[PDB]
Paper text:
To address this challenge, we develop a computational “anchor extension” methodology for targeting protein interfaces by extending a peptide chain around a non-canonical amino acid residue anchor. To test our approach using a well characterized model system, we design cyclic peptides that inhibit histone deacetylases 2 and 6 (HDAC2 and HDAC6) with enhanced potency compared to the original anchor (IC50 values of 9.1 and 4.4 nM for the best binders compared to 5.4 and 0.6 µM for the anchor, respectively). SHA can coordinate to the zinc ion in the active site of HDACs. In all the crystal structures we obtained, the thiol functional group of SHA coordinates the catalytic Zn2+ ion with a Zn2+– S separation of 2.3 Å in a distorted tetrahedral geometry reminiscent of that observed for the inhibitor Largazole.
To circumvent this problem, in design round 2, we built up macrocyclic scaffolds de novo inside the protein pocket to increase shape complementarity between the peptide and the HDAC2 pocket, and to make additional favorable interactions between the peptide backbone atoms and HDAC2. We also incorporated a Trp residue as an additional anchor that lays flat on a hydrophobic surface close to the active site, and mimics an aromatic ring observed in the same position in several small molecule inhibitors of HDACs. The macrocycle chain was extended from the SHA-Trp dimer, and the conformational space of closed macrocycles harboring these two residues was explored using generalized kinematic loop closure. The best tested peptide, des2.1.0 had an IC50 value of 49.3 nM, a four-fold improvement over method 1. To improve the affinity of des2.1.0, we mutated a D-Lys7 residue adjacent to a hydrophobic pocket in des2.1.0 to D-Met. The new des2.1.1 had an improved IC50 value of 16 nM for HDAC2. The crystal structure of des2.1.1 matches the designed orientation for the two anchor residues, SHA and Trp, with the position of the water molecules retained. While the electron density map for SHA and Trp are well resolved and match the designed model, the rest of the molecule appears to be in a conformation different from the solution structure obtained by NMR and the designed model; however, the electron density is too weak or absent, and the thermal B-factors are too high, for those residues to enable a meaningful comparison. This flexibility is consistent with the observation of multiple states during conformational sampling.
Author numbering:
A (entry chain F): 500 to 508
B (entry chain A): 8 to 379
Amino acid sequence: XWXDNXXXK
Amino acid sequence: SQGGGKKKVCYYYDGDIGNYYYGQGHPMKPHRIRMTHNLLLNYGLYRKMEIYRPHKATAEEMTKYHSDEYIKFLRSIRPDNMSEYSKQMQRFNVGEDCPVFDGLFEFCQLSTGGSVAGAVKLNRQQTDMAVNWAGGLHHAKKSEASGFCYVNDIVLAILELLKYHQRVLYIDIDIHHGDGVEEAFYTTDRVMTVSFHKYGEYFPGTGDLRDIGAGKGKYYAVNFPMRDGIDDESYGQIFKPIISKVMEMYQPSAVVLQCGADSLSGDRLGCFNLTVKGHAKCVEVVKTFNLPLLMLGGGGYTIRNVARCWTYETAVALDCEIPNELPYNDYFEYFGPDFKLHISPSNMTNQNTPEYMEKIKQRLFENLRMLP
Ligand code: NA
Ligand code: NA
Ligand SMILES: [Zn+2]
């Protein structure tokens, strides 16, 4: 959810 | 009875909810709930609804869904003893996206307490609607945290409604997929979960059109995948017909509506192009069916628009028209440079073609036809 770099997040 | 009239609203808020801090740079700001509360007070909306302070939900109330091992970890973990729980932090998905902060468990108690108390107030038929903007944490799983959510207050509040309601309807207009609520009731027909969300290289990566439930819950999970930049007109063209078709086929006796504001235009994490009026249109559509309704919060990370959205949606629930000129409040500078209640959409491209919206809706009606 917060940020990018895989897994969405 | 005919399905109308002004509804009684019970509003849940704890003045300490705005002091919990996720950490520097973290987009989840519980201060937005205090801004929302202070804004609707200066609008005078406290005269039209009953304001309650929620209790702190105990670990016993949370274990009605969550595992004992996961809840006991939430009571124990603190910023001063993270080194001892470094293994348990990874097991329960705590430390990065869902960080450890001071009063973490208390924040979960206040957020959950408002939701379960609203469900009790609805079960006892002492209100028509219950509002808990601190709730709506739709990502929390049975034994792990996710998407800034630690305890899934929605699942606990719906389990409370299932004591007196045979069928409960969950609607999720957060820009992210309501995976936690959908997973909890994926194999039962007593709860139908309807989620509108962005799909494709986006958190949490679930919510495909072809996810309709399993077992006895097959065709009782509805997901509308969307692309970037959807506006009020495209969103309103599909929400009302799909919700109307769900009410006809499923016929619930209670409704839970998660009103995540991160689907608004200009959200720090969202990429939709909705306005407050387009977002609040979903509230008054669900409201027209005159069923016991629990309104919860959720996402929303441009906090000045979050305070706008949930204040207006509270007035919509109260059927009270409030002026676009924002009254003075303790956070008046947050709403510059316009100091208006309603927002305007951006010039971003709506990648949701009208034919795409019509095709996804048509395939969802096929699934709804498989209900008894
Ligand atoms: Na959603
Ligand atoms: Na279900
Ligand atoms: Zn979200």
